[PDB]
Structure 1
Amino acid sequence: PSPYVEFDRRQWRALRMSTPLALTEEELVGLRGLGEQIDLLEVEEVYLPLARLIHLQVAARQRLFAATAEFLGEPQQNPDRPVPFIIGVAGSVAVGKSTTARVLQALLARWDHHPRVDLVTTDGFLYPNAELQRRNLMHRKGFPESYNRRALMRFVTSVKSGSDYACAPVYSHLHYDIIPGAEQVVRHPDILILEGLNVLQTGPTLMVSDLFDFSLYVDARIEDIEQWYVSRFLAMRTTAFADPESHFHHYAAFSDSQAVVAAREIWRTINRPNLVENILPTRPRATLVLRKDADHSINRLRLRKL
């Protein structure tokens, strides 16, 4: 067959699992907190079992650190604690990577084995617009060479080294740019989740995904992502684009049909080809592939056989 265990949505719901996990209320509220109309039943029935499965791998890895150091008789060059466990999250623009990552961050943090869960986006590793322009790369923003790969690699290397201090830059969607002087600090978390278009992309030598212990790809039909993309663009007319200072402000004025035309064109010329050429070929590289239906609900989980 294949290197994956496949469950469709029914098959997965059917599963007679070995613990009731039960979200508090409390937790259900916190999950509504980031609630871009987050489906709480799906968080509970799909993501929570999911996070438990990841938990098992984090915990196993914690014990392996311990057993290994015991064997070595705890040499001075060995770290005193397991380095952070790194989870990559990949997928198209508008597939909902980000919400997926934020859910997992909250769900994974409820175990005492690893309460400290961080979330970094590779958006912060895009070259500033100014630099991107100097390189004649603006039409290519979001494509592989539009990221400071050297810096992104230094960052993840540093976190995997168990260094207790590592900075990422920050990117503002509002301004469509890197915020000068802004940094996010990461202090040896138990889990780092690294979310981005490009986390499973491949390169000539050691690549960031070589430092991952788990990774997911959020999948859906290309037609469906297109519709979610267009719907998001029109909704931003009245949120992010409403705000002046948003350098897509001139988009807040577009009528529905004018905004559709414009959104479709950014889709067909930039995001869809990025997906076909650079993001989609990384799908088979993830530990877990979650496919979404048109209504955003998960209709298929593929997980690496253990």
Structure 2
Amino acid sequence: EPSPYVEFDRRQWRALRMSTPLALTEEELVGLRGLGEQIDLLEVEEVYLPLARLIHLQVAARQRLFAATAEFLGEPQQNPDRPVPFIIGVAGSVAVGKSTTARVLQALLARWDHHPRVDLVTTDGFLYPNAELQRRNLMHRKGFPESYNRRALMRFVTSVKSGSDYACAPVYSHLHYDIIPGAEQVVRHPDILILEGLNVLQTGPTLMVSDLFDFSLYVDARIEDIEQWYVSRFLAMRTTAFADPESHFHHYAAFSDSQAVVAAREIWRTINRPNLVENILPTRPRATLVLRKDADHSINRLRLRKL
């Protein structure tokens, strides 16, 4: 049976790296890694390089696509000092590693000849303020489609891929568990925009942000494993993030391994799991590339969309 997909194992995927140079150090990789993530330079070599490659092969092949339409419209022939931004989406569950995969990818792509302006934006800042969520009875649905100002998010990405000089996005504080008043992330006509979020790959009755993606990644892993990663990380934050008195979850810092496991599991059970199952996972089929990780966090398989 023919397929739109083609899968790989790490063995065969790494062979597609070719001369693709490794331009990241260990000190560097580290400041990109998130708590609990196991990524090392090796993985960046056998997985992220063949990927950085693919992406570059398509950045050019994609500019052709907006050209034709421009040629068709008898329009000028756009200056390469400002071509059409290449949008990349990185999706996946809470605690799966999106943040790291996205951070690393941006590091690699920025370190490409010419030094392309590679901006990274998370959908966090597009969450409705806690006050607005309290108003809609969603304080326990943070992460669900409805907890996002999807209208603003679309306005943002649209603005950037449509050639705007600069666009603004709100900023989210993980420390305060809310949107930061008066804060803004400014994106000035980047060459590449990486949008990271749980939702990003979603589709609906209206043109959405996933409809503006030129390439997209979906970081996958077995669900019982993501819960483990999730819980585990929760316990580990008692001494990192939760340790801070200014933290909205400072009260978890004192929990015992036992109590902490209980609380972690309940959040997983009542928020992140349902969301993963009802909204995220059903978007995986549309991902250009899927990075499958084993219980140890290692990416040992991949599924590519050839069609």
TM over 0.5: yes
Query: Structure 1 pair 34/268, CA: closer, same or farther in 2 (3 Å)?
Result: closer
Q: Deviations over 1:226-258 (max 9, x none)?
A: 100011111111111000111111000011111
Query: Structure 1 pair 254/25, CA: closer, same or farther in 2 (3 Å)?
Result: closer
Structure 1 gaps of 5+ residues are none
TM-superposed CA distance for 1:55, in Å, is: 1.0
TM-superposed CA distance for 1:81, in Å, is: 3.3
Q: In terms of mean alpha carbon deviation, does 63-72 or 103-112 score higher? A: 63-72
Query: Structure 1 pair 28/204, CA: closer, same or farther in 2 (3 Å)?
Result: closer
Q: In terms of mean alpha carbon deviation, does 57-66 or 250-259 score higher? A: 57-66
Q: In terms of mean alpha carbon deviation, does 73-82 or 135-144 score higher? A: 73-82
Task: Quote the Cα distance in structure 1 between the aligned partners of 2:199 and 2:220.
Answer: 14
Query: Structure 1 pair 107/98, CA: closer, same or farther in 2 (3 Å)?
Result: same
Query: Structure 1 pair 211/95, CA: closer, same or farther in 2 (3 Å)?
Result: same
Query: Structure 1 pair 144/229, CA: closer, same or farther in 2 (3 Å)?
Result: same
Query: Structure 1 pair 230/195, CA: closer, same or farther in 2 (3 Å)?
Result: same
Q: In terms of mean alpha carbon deviation, does 26-35 or 268-277 score higher? A: 26-35
Query: Structure 1 pair 15/69, CA: closer, same or farther in 2 (3 Å)?
Result: closer
Report what 2:6 is aligned to.
5
Q: Report if the CA contact (8 A) 1:65-1:82 is conserved.
A: no
Task: Quote the Cα distance in structure 2 between the aligned partners of 1:14 and 1:223.
Answer: 31
Q: Percent identity?
A: 100
Q: Report if the CA contact (8 A) 1:114-1:190 is conserved.
A: no
Task: Quote the Cα distance in structure 1 between the aligned partners of 2:198 and 2:41.
Answer: 25
Task: Quote the Cα distance in structure 1 between the aligned partners of 2:295 and 2:147.
Answer: 30
Q: Report if the CA contact (8 A) 1:86-1:213 is conserved.
A: yes
TM-superposed CA distance for 1:300, in Å, is: 1.1
Query: Structure 1 pair 179/27, CA: closer, same or farther in 2 (3 Å)?
Result: closer
TM-superposed CA distance for 1:222, in Å, is: 0.3
Query: Structure 1 pair 65/34, CA: closer, same or farther in 2 (3 Å)?
Result: farther
Report what 2:250 is aligned to.
249
TM-superposed CA distance for 1:67, in Å, is: 6.7
What SS does the corresponding residue of 1:86 show, helix, strand or coil? strand
Q: In terms of mean alpha carbon deviation, does 50-59 or 88-97 score higher? A: 50-59
TM-superposed CA distance for 1:302, in Å, is: 0.9
TM-superposed CA distance for 1:82, in Å, is: 1.7
Q: Report if the CA contact (8 A) 1:236-1:252 is conserved.
A: yes
Query: Are residue 109 (structure 1) and residue 110 (structure 2) matched?
Result: yes
Query: Structure 1 pair 245/33, CA: closer, same or farther in 2 (3 Å)?
Result: closer
Q: Deviations over 1:238-288 (max 9, x none)?
A: 111000111111000011111111101111111000000000000001111
Query: Structure 1 pair 167/92, CA: closer, same or farther in 2 (3 Å)?
Result: same
Query: Structure 1 pair 21/73, CA: closer, same or farther in 2 (3 Å)?
Result: farther
Q: Report if the CA contact (8 A) 1:31-1:40 is conserved.
A: no
TM-superposed CA distance for 1:38, in Å, is: 3.0
Task: Quote the Cα distance in structure 2 between the aligned partners of 1:270 and 1:120.
Answer: 23
Task: Quote the Cα distance in structure 1 between the aligned partners of 2:198 and 2:248.
Answer: 22
Q: Deviations over 1:24-58 (max 9, x none)?
A: 77866776799955311101111111111111111
Query: Structure 1 pair 260/37, CA: closer, same or farther in 2 (3 Å)?
Result: same
Task: Quote the Cα distance in structure 1 between the aligned partners of 2:39 and 2:202.
Answer: 28
Task: Quote the Cα distance in structure 1 between the aligned partners of 2:210 and 2:136.
Answer: 26
TM-superposed CA distance for 1:63, in Å, is: 5.0
TM-superposed CA distance for 1:62, in Å, is: 3.5
Query: Structure 1 pair 267/2, CA: closer, same or farther in 2 (3 Å)?
Result: same
Task: Quote the Cα distance in structure 2 between the aligned partners of 1:105 and 1:211.
Answer: 18
Query: Structure 1 pair 24/229, CA: closer, same or farther in 2 (3 Å)?
Result: closer
Q: Report if the CA contact (8 A) 1:59-1:113 is conserved.
A: no
TM-score for both structures, normalised by structure 1: 0.91
TM-superposed CA distance for 1:139, in Å, is: 1.3
Task: Quote the Cα distance in structure 2 between the aligned partners of 1:28 and 1:128.
Answer: 32
Query: Structure 1 pair 133/194, CA: closer, same or farther in 2 (3 Å)?
Result: same
Task: Quote the Cα distance in structure 1 between the aligned partners of 2:286 and 2:247.
Answer: 36
